[PDB]
Ligand binder design. Sequence first.
Ligand SMILES: Nc1nc2c(ncn2[C@@H]2O[C@H](COP(=O)(O)OP(=O)(O)O)[C@@H](O)[C@H]2O)c(=O)[nH]1
Ligand SMILES: [Mg+2]
Lengths: 469, 166, 166
Amino acid sequence: QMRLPSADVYRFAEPDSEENIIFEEGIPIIKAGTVIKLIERLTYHMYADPNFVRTFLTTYRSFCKPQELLSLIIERFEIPEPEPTEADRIAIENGDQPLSAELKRFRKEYIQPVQLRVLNVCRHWVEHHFYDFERDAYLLQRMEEFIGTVRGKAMKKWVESITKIIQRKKIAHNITFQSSPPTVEWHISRPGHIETFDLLTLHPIEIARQLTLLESDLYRAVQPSELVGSVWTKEDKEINSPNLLKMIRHTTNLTLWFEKCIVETENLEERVAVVSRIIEILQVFQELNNFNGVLEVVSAMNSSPVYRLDHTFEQIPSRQKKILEEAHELSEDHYKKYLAKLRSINPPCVPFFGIYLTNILKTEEGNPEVLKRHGKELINFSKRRKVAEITGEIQQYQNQPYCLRVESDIKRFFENLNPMGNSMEKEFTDYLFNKSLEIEPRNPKPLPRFPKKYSYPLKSPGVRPSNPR
Amino acid sequence: MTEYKLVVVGAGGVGKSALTIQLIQNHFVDEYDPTIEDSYRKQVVIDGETCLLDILDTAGQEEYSAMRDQYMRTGEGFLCVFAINNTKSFEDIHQYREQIKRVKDSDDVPMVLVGNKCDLAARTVESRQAQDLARSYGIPYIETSAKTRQGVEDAFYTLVREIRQH
Amino acid sequence: MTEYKLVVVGAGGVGKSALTIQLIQNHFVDEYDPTIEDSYRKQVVIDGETCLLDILDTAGQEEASAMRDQYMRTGEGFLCVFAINNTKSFEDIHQYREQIKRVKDSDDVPMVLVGNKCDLAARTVESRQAQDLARSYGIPYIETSAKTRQGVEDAFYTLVREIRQH
Ligand SMILES: Nc1nc2c(ncn2[C@@H]2O[C@H](COP(=O)(O)OP(=O)(O)O)[C@@H](O)[C@H]2O)c(=O)[nH]1
Ligand SMILES: [Mg+2]
């Protein structure tokens, strides 16, 4: 075999045991283990683990402080070189150069793999988890000191590179497409007339597009640190999960806007135009794989004020009800169909984050932080692998960008949307419901009539794109 | 057999998630993965009568306030939970109830008020308070400590009985 | 959906990482940073079937020998990259092919010969030269440019079709 360093001069040489490391039942998968053992596997020398580094760097903060994580990998990096074999000694003692057969093998199979993987952890740590350094200046100096004193011509390539990445991170993403984006569609409102922009005056195709761009961005901005430790459900949610919340609020605001648009259009016929146009937007959303968008409409249609408007939905064409039903069925039975759908589309897409939040939360508090074996309290790594499996999935859908041209004025119209105004959730919500009672009263009270409110034609230009440019 | 669609409502942080898990999961397995089908169904026997529980739980999705009505409409009975160490959550209950009455468009919707002990922090809502609130609504009151598996089954079965007797 | 583990090999500097990030993010990396070991996941529909691609990015330097082998043991398909303006990278291919044949102990492993950086004008390897090497390996040859996206998808998806039909 190949002799490892002495466990008395290198802690990461201590043998595995049912007391410091548990394997799951074709690389090994760690179920539980000590911080020391966990870090040994994070940089093992036998095999590669595509997810270990990300899983670890994403979740370690609950069971290990940053300052200690660094000390430990530096400790792991400092592998003591093995004493000469008997042959080496014999040669040296005769004034000859030792062959060093084992020493060379020990470097090729243990030292290099280990040291390279420790540097890989340093590189990723600095690259995608820099906040750790932004909150601990000393932590950064130690890293710089460490990376900057790694001697040897071997590691130089990488050491040199990490040093640069670190600096680049203190000082302060373009996209290439095969085909170019489709032409921006305009309806009644013309370019540069933000005073007229509105649900029925903007092209429905373009409303779905600009909102899909807007929503895709909000999705791509959520960081894992806003999800680990169920921090978006705690008192400091505003501080720890600002991107997540910003994204969830946009969804809510748009849902409420749709609801407001529907119920404030008192005239039956005009309201049917309003509802129909929104279902058309839903249709484009589905085409663009904007599942988040699809659900905002569904939620609007299923809210208390809109759901009960039977006289309106009765007059909705047969084809559109079917569209809205398929859409609604997505969420039915715990999002069974939705999950199937998302697993099968060809991104770019904008998933619905609610599913992920619920899974992360249940996983977080349905699994112990540690598992005990013979008294020892091992870190429950399987619980972390599960949370990182989710953050990983989320990140996979964050890579693909939409080939759509942004239209500034339309983006702004939707960013400054504020259905609620100065009202509080309850007040606004009740206002919407009363409006529902006013436009379509409860039985046996008969349905009244209201005067039209729009002066422009209500005919939709449709959702099939035009091809002139 | 009959299936009961039960909805667990309440402010974020009150432990709605732990309750659902404690009822559905296996208390004797090292690992739990809610990313596995039917971590919401459960076949149980209540008063000798067998039935299937379908827990519609959306913990973590509280901020998606405009999706609430949709999630609630499919429920047959509701668990209105609050934390005994959080007065806000307790004072919120009133609106959760009004919202349920609105989405189900009924005045008597089967429901149970649940006061949960999340941690070891100082209790700020006493039983009498909660008990009195429950009486005013004419619904049952059950205090649980999902963390110690106390009152959980009691809370859900009481709701199932509410639906039956309804 | 099916999962496909693709491994990108070749001498350092040929562009293994640029091609990979161009595929994953539609972004071109202008700066150079030696890779150690990286993995990327990509959900894509190829020929009507939904795939889950696992792209393993490797380092081509000697210090990574042991490591690269470990990445090749688990891969099903291989992207063998060289740069059309670096003759040593084209001469290094032979070694990487042999390494793969040895690790996976097979003379029939799915792979594509990739001649990258075809957007540059200073070519030093002839298409015909590479084409002949590919034919002797019984695999396709695809020239690409991670900077312009030219041939990028072709290379990767062609590899997928070879793993599926294998
Ligand atoms: N012009 C051009 N430069 C490229 C191309 N692919 C890679 N490069 C550059 O070549 C350098 C090395 O790329 P990298 O992806 O790190 O190569 P690797 O060492 O094989 O991983 C970087 O400066 C890249 O920007 C390409 O297709 N065209
Ligand atoms: Mg590279």
